[PDB]
Design a protein around this ligand. Structure first.
Ligand SMILES: *[C@@H]1O[C@H](CO)[C@@H](O[C@@H]2O[C@H](CO)[C@@H](O[C@@H]3O[C@H](CO[C@H]4O[C@H](CO)[C@@H](O)[C@H](O)[C@@H]4O)[C@@H](O)[C@H](O[C@H]4O[C@H](CO)[C@@H](O)[C@H](O)[C@@H]4O)[C@@H]3O)[C@H](O)[C@H]2NC(C)=O)[C@H](O)[C@H]1NC(C)=O
Ligand SMILES: *[C@@H]1O[C@H](CO)[C@@H](O[C@@H]2O[C@H](CO)[C@@H](O[C@@H]3O[C@H](CO[C@H]4O[C@H](CO)[C@@H](O)[C@H](O)[C@@H]4O)[C@@H](O)[C@H](O[C@H]4O[C@H](CO)[C@@H](O)[C@H](O)[C@@H]4O)[C@@H]3O)[C@H](O)[C@H]2NC(C)=O)[C@H](O)[C@H]1NC(C)=O
Ligand SMILES: *[C@@H]1O[C@H](CO)[C@@H](O[C@@H]2O[C@H](CO)[C@@H](O[C@@H]3O[C@H](CO[C@H]4O[C@H](CO)[C@@H](O)[C@H](O)[C@@H]4O)[C@@H](O)[C@H](O[C@H]4O[C@H](CO)[C@@H](O)[C@H](O)[C@@H]4O)[C@@H]3O)[C@H](O)[C@H]2NC(C)=O)[C@H](O)[C@H]1NC(C)=O
Ligand SMILES: *[C@@H]1O[C@H](CO)[C@@H](O[C@@H]2O[C@H](CO)[C@@H](O[C@@H]3O[C@H](CO[C@H]4O[C@H](CO)[C@@H](O)[C@H](O)[C@@H]4O)[C@@H](O)[C@H](O[C@H]4O[C@H](CO)[C@@H](O)[C@H](O)[C@@H]4O)[C@@H]3O)[C@H](O)[C@H]2NC(C)=O)[C@H](O)[C@H]1NC(C)=O
Ligand SMILES: *[C@@H]1O[C@H](CO)[C@@H](O[C@@H]2O[C@H](CO)[C@@H](O[C@@H]3O[C@H](CO[C@H]4O[C@H](CO)[C@@H](O)[C@H](O)[C@@H]4O)[C@@H](O)[C@H](O[C@H]4O[C@H](CO)[C@@H](O)[C@H](O)[C@@H]4O)[C@@H]3O)[C@H](O)[C@H]2NC(C)=O)[C@H](O)[C@H]1NC(C)=O
Ligand SMILES: *[C@@H]1O[C@H](CO)[C@@H](O[C@@H]2O[C@H](CO)[C@@H](O[C@@H]3O[C@H](CO[C@H]4O[C@H](CO)[C@@H](O)[C@H](O)[C@@H]4O)[C@@H](O)[C@H](O[C@H]4O[C@H](CO)[C@@H](O)[C@H](O)[C@@H]4O)[C@@H]3O)[C@H](O)[C@H]2NC(C)=O)[C@H](O)[C@H]1NC(C)=O
Ligand SMILES: *[C@@H]1O[C@H](CO)[C@@H](O[C@@H]2O[C@H](CO)[C@@H](O[C@@H]3O[C@H](CO[C@H]4O[C@H](CO)[C@@H](O)[C@H](O)[C@@H]4O)[C@@H](O)[C@H](O[C@H]4O[C@H](CO)[C@@H](O)[C@H](O)[C@@H]4O)[C@@H]3O)[C@H](O)[C@H]2NC(C)=O)[C@H](O)[C@H]1NC(C)=O
Ligand SMILES: *[C@@H]1O[C@H](CO)[C@@H](O[C@@H]2O[C@H](CO)[C@@H](O[C@@H]3O[C@H](CO[C@H]4O[C@H](CO)[C@@H](O)[C@H](O)[C@@H]4O)[C@@H](O)[C@H](O[C@H]4O[C@H](CO)[C@@H](O)[C@H](O)[C@@H]4O)[C@@H]3O)[C@H](O)[C@H]2NC(C)=O)[C@H](O)[C@H]1NC(C)=O
Ligand SMILES: *[C@@H]1O[C@H](CO)[C@@H](O[C@@H]2O[C@H](CO)[C@@H](O[C@@H]3O[C@H](CO)[C@@H](O)[C@H](O)[C@@H]3O)[C@H](O)[C@H]2NC(C)=O)[C@H](O)[C@H]1NC(C)=O
Ligand SMILES: *[C@@H]1O[C@H](CO)[C@@H](O[C@@H]2O[C@H](CO)[C@@H](O[C@@H]3O[C@H](CO)[C@@H](O)[C@H](O)[C@@H]3O)[C@H](O)[C@H]2NC(C)=O)[C@H](O)[C@H]1NC(C)=O
Ligand SMILES: *[C@@H]1O[C@H](CO)[C@@H](O[C@@H]2O[C@H](CO)[C@@H](O[C@@H]3O[C@H](CO)[C@@H](O)[C@H](O)[C@@H]3O)[C@H](O)[C@H]2NC(C)=O)[C@H](O)[C@H]1NC(C)=O
Ligand SMILES: *[C@@H]1O[C@H](CO)[C@@H](O[C@@H]2O[C@H](CO)[C@@H](O)[C@H](O)[C@H]2NC(C)=O)[C@H](O)[C@H]1NC(C)=O
Ligand SMILES: [K+]
Lengths: 187, 134, 134, 187, 134, 187
């Protein structure tokens, strides 16, 4: 590009796949659904969705009270690594387990083969301002404009799923996820 | 100077950056190109001989956050893929690459940041003149 | 270049700032004049077509905090009202405006920051010389 | 101003009233009294004062335990907007309702027509260091040097009052108040 | 200009820094030399007439934290003891001192940051040229 | 150093002893042991050590529950100043007394003449991620690489001792300690 008689405008495009291939990354399918993947070789991903519908009931389901690891079935060979990725997501969301609304997870006897973690982000259930903080964190972590987008119940659901390439990899979501979880390993 | 490897760039053509521009990364300024080069250097050293422990040093968190907040507001932001530099063709001396801003899922047109590449070009030429006088 | 509106300034006289200085706002540097211009641009776009959602992007929180910490310590600080720039009258080329520091509820005298406007003036003249040589 | 043969020193003064006219702002009467105003049109302001005297007693007054909204009378037509401004003030002070001293507010049957919110910032009542944090936050938010200024108990009292132009508007206090409350609206 | 006192420096030699370089501290840039000078000025004022209340203003926390993160990673960092500046001997005009980086409990050799002092020298000479033309 | 025909490289070395002589400082003997010193004239220092061994048992020892001051014996003439330095260390470590593992301290009737404050930073005792945060804070505050260095229980012991010049003063550890405790004095 001719800036001047002797000067040219030049560009270089960066390929960061190899640098970020073995580290947790994130995507955005739409402003509601996001997939978190530890690395390319993993066949399992985690789906974070902002949903109006309720999937877990307090009466019939388990509650996350310092026992998040029990939400994942012992039989899966990636149980520890899955729980690690869940902790990566929660730490990335700046979640305070002491005071923020108690997450619910699926009953141990559930027929369905997905671990479901449900957080109630409705204004009434949470302390004032929690929905705003959580939505802004979702935008900061996944690139969504859900916070800017306009009583309806709102929930944050993290379910495990098979990696079927639901999203193109983004190394900036990877940088955000890594910065939130600094000096840590999956576990 | 610092030659980028084939796998680092999509183009697959060797790009060697002169030490003066790359020296400008060591200054107080926090950049997006310099951060990416730091990531590349860390990856190279790791291959020769951990990213979670070094991510804070390698990456500027404040600059990443401001770029994403620009992204969410439909303002031109840096998404860390393409970088533009002013390269004096005859001598080969070039400016420090700057992030090619993106808005609405499309890279900004050259005119849309014309001043940015105009002044850089002038500065580069000015520096060259001094080298002749010095 | 960028012409400020009548209501923006107390003086009510049109002030048009050239694109090179205003281009210097896009650099890594976080300024106080650039923040105020970003606020004015946001207000103009809002009138044509929300400040709480954009306040983080528009305003540098760290710079605001350091200025107030200077204020509380009876040190010259930037209170975001008056900004001084070096304007080469004949050509019309001017420096990027810088915050007129205030101490003890009074604007600093011109001498109290003489070096700041001395060196800045020199830089501007130097750049002009290069434009003639280039 | 004549810097040199060809160079002049020139200045521009900013009028930022119109940018900040419709957004919450703050002022400082003295290092103790501060007025928080939603916008020029509002006829009601909130007075934050650091006072030695005690206005609310635990035995005869109400306590703020997740029910701040009840402190404001239902009959006022700006009740929700007033509670919103109160939340702006508390969030700006980085108040942690879970652990920081329990605020007291006036009894429902009080003859006086002021909503009074009293926070005990004395060293004994609060956990160690709370008085320092609160005073530094007051200086950061209102421009006061109360923290630098030199056993006497202290209280932080937020009462509502009629806007009588007690102080000139400052758009820097407005910037600080907005930065503390980011991506939020009165409610 | 600004003369450092005998007790400030280990050499116990009077080192006077010209006002242009020291003026560069007032810019947006956060430095390590400028922070140390601010600490010295605060100490002098305290002697004439508190450090805990002023530490945030005097010291850049972000720069200190990034230097510590470099230290923990066995990367050259600034430990706030030695500072290198380029000093044109004949005129006496000098660049703003920059932190002499340290790695593995040893100061970097001059060659290990050669580019850093090369470009600064060039910049200094360039400025001097303009002063002759201006 | 001869940069060029007209240019020389020159250096200045800073002596910061006098600036930092009367303010709390810290040092690092090895990646495990650290000494915190109030000032040159103090004859007492505090030893922060990362130790596998257990010195305090919950059954026979006291627990720090808003009564840290009682851990130091009343008869020592610098007890308030010692407690102040302890609060400096805890604040520098970003310790959350409300939720982080309860510190233990020596029994009042202990024959040994040293105040011992024991924090259990083993992963099992604390909430997930606490050990990582505490080790990273120790590296940030004392310059240690303990976090980077690789079930064995881990403890953080702060004991008082006589200042025997166990380490050279470092004014950068002093800056870190002061920045952590900003706007406070020993008490
Ligand atoms: C993480 O850990 C938490 C700990 O809180 C677990 O939550 C508990 O789960 C247990 C089952 O493991 C449930 O306990 C149930 O308690 C009922 C009575 O409790 C009353 O009081 C508590 C508060 O004290 C209330 O929460 C509760 O609603 C009641 O009012 C019993 O009715 C239940 O009995 C059921 O199971 C037994 C077998 O154990 C059968 O014999 C009964 O017929 C009946 O089916 C039961 O004991 C309860 O859900 C939780 N209790 C508390 C105190 O929180 C999470 O399960 C765990 N989650 C994960 C993911 O690991
Ligand atoms: C997302 O996370 C979910 C967890 O919620 C995973 O789904 C679980 O997957 C595991 C396998 O890793 C399943 O466990 C297996 O279930 C089989 C059938 O379940 C029956 O088990 C007995 C059979 O009598 C009865 O209770 C009943 O009929 C159940 O339906 C078992 O046959 C398997 O047993 C085999 O493996 C174990 C472990 O080695 C051996 O001991 C056995 O001998 C045998 O070889 C096994 O238990 C589990 O059922 C699934 N979840 C649920 C809730 O049922 C997903 O895989 C995961 N997805 C991703 C993509 O990560
Ligand atoms: C920073 O922001 C820029 C935007 O300016 C991003 O660059 C774009 O990246 C996208 C990927 O998200 C690129 O789109 C992909 O292009 C590939 C090339 O095929 C197309 O080539 C040109 C278009 O450039 C067309 O002529 C041609 O017909 C092809 O369409 C495709 O292989 C990709 O297809 C994938 O996605 C589609 C989605 O529908 C699927 O159907 C496909 O199966 C496949 O999965 C895709 O279209 C785009 O070209 C880039 N733009 C530019 C200008 O180069 C950066 O990625 C972004 N970086 C970060 C880190 O965020
Ligand atoms: C926000 O919500 C909190 C919830 O705690 C409210 O605080 C309660 O307010 C009610 C009135 O609305 C009061 O309840 C009183 O409880 C007394 C006994 O409580 C003792 O123990 C608790 C600790 O658990 C102490 O806090 C308390 O001071 C007491 O020591 C009763 O004796 C009182 O009875 C009085 O009223 C009844 C009529 O209701 C009469 O019949 C009696 O004779 C007597 O006059 C009373 O029931 C009390 O103030 C608070 N209680 C508790 C448990 O916290 C806040 O008021 C509310 N704030 C706002 C702004 O909405
Ligand atoms: C700062 O915040 C305070 C609240 O703490 C506000 O003061 C309140 O102002 C409202 C105005 O809306 C007052 O409400 C009105 O009070 C009148 C008198 O109250 C009496 O009510 C009954 C009558 O017997 C008795 O309990 C007793 O005598 C009380 O003194 C009433 O006349 C009003 O009622 C009218 O309006 C309502 C609603 O429209 C109708 O239902 C009625 O029929 C009637 O028309 C009304 O209730 C309130 O009393 C004040 N608080 C207190 C504690 O007295 C301040 O205004 C506010 N300041 C600013 C600047 O915003
Ligand atoms: C920033 O980083 C630099 C490292 O590049 C530090 O500078 C070094 O500081 C250390 C102190 O930690 C200095 O070492 C001390 O030197 C003194 C001078 O005596 C020696 O002089 C030269 C070596 O310079 C030799 O020829 C001679 O024989 C002596 O050995 C000694 O007095 C000191 O000894 C002290 O420590 C030893 C430890 O074993 C004890 O035995 C002694 O009794 C005594 O306590 C010590 O050796 C070193 O010289 C500095 N390096 C340089 C290149 O100047 C900065 O201190 C550091 N700054 C910060 C703020 O972190
Ligand atoms: C800071 O403040 C804390 C407050 O928690 C103090 O911790 C208490 O210390 C007291 C002694 O001062 C101890 O109390 C003991 O309680 C036992 C029974 O308590 C049961 O229940 C509590 C919880 O409610 C459990 O923690 C406990 O383990 C028991 O299950 C008694 O057995 C003890 O009696 C002993 O002392 C009495 C004299 O007072 C003798 O007569 C007895 O024979 C016997 O020796 C005793 O009362 C206990 O350690 C703590 N209690 C609680 C509730 O926490 C810290 O001491 C204090 N620390 C500092 C540094 O100031
Ligand atoms: C680190 O912190 C520890 C505290 O944990 C300090 O050690 C304490 O030092 C103080 C010094 O002030 C000691 O207090 C003195 O102890 C002496 C012996 O204690 C005995 O007390 C009675 C006597 O029968 C019995 O219970 C038993 O025998 C004890 O062994 C006393 O002689 C002293 O009393 C004298 O002074 C007091 C006050 O002035 C007078 O009232 C008396 O009449 C008398 O003159 C005094 O009490 C204390 O004992 C030490 N702690 C422990 C646990 O033993 C360290 O000094 C500190 N280190 C640093 C460097 O600061
Ligand atoms: C998630 O949080 C939301 C918000 O708190 C919960 O919805 C709330 O559910 C309660 C009942 O548990 C509702 O209270 C009811 O209100 C009606 C009048 O609307 C009243 O007649 C009943 O007696 C009862 O008080 C409340 O209105 C409702 N709020 C909203 C905004 O829908 C929801 O239950 C939580 N879900 C889970 C799975 O935890
Ligand atoms: C705000 O907090 C302060 C400080 O915690 C409270 O003052 C405290 O009031 C209590 C009474 O409940 C005092 O306790 C009494 O102290 C005297 C000693 O002077 C003693 O004779 C009594 O037996 C009793 O212990 C306490 O000393 C006092 N603290 C201080 C530092 O003065 C104040 O009451 C709180 N205000 C409100 C409105 O709650
Ligand atoms: C500091 O925290 C660690 C970790 O939480 C504590 O070690 C824990 O000690 C308990 C005993 O109270 C151990 O429980 C026992 O474990 C064995 C299995 O080895 C079992 O036979 C017993 O029935 C009982 O469950 C626990 O395993 C152990 N945890 C670890 C990770 O080693 C330690 O005691 C704490 N220190 C202090 C001073 O409190
Ligand atoms: C920093 O500069 C000092 C001078 O202030 C240099 O020390 C001198 O080194 C020369 C060359 O060996 C000697 O002739 C002088 O006697 C030294 N002077 C003093 C006061 O020691 C020193 O080399 C420089 N420091 C570096 C390069 O780390
Ligand atoms: K808490």
């Amino acid at each position: 590009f001719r800036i001047g008689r002797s000067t040219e405008l030049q560009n270089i495009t960066f390929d960061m796949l190899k640098v970020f291939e073995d580290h947790p990354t994130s995507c955005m399918v739409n402003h509601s659904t996001y997939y978190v993947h530890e690395n390319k070789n993993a066949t399992w991903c985690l789906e974070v969705s902002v949903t109006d519908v309720t999937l877990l009931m307090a009466e019939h389901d388990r509650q996350v009270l310092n026992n998040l690891s029990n939400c994942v079935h012992p039989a899966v060979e990636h149980r520890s690594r899955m729980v690690g990725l869940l902790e990566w997501i929660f730490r990335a969301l700046k979640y305070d387990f002491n005071h923020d609304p108690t997450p619910l997870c699926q009953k141990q006897t559930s027929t369905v083969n997905e671990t479901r973690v449900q957080i109630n982000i409705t204004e009434g259930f949470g302390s004032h301002g929690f929905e705003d903080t959580i939505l802004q964190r979702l935008g900061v972590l996944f690139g969504s404009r859900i916070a800017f987008s306009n009583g309806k119940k709102r929930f944050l659901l993290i379910r495990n799923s098979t990696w079927k390439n639901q999203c193109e990899m983004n190394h900036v979501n990877s940088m955000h996820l890594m910065l939130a979880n600094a000096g840590r390993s999956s576990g | 100077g610092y030659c980028l490897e084939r796998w680092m760039l999509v183009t697959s053509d060797l790009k060697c950056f002169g030490n003066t521009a790359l020296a400008k990364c060591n200054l107080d300024h926090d950049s997006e190109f310099c951060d990416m080069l730091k990531l590349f250097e860390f990856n190279k050293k790791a291959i020769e001989t951990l990213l979670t422990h070094s991510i804070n040093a390698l990456i500027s968190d404040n600059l990443l956050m401001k770029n994403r907040l620009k992204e969410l507001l439909n303002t031109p932001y840096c998404n860390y893929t393409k970088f533009w530099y002013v390269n004096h063709t005859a001598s080969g001396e070039h400016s420090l690459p700057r992030c090619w801003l993106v808005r609405n899922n499309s890279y900004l047109n050259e005119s849309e940041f014309r001043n940015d590449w105009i002044i850089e070009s002038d500065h580069l030429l000015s520096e060259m003149l001094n080298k002749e006088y010095i």
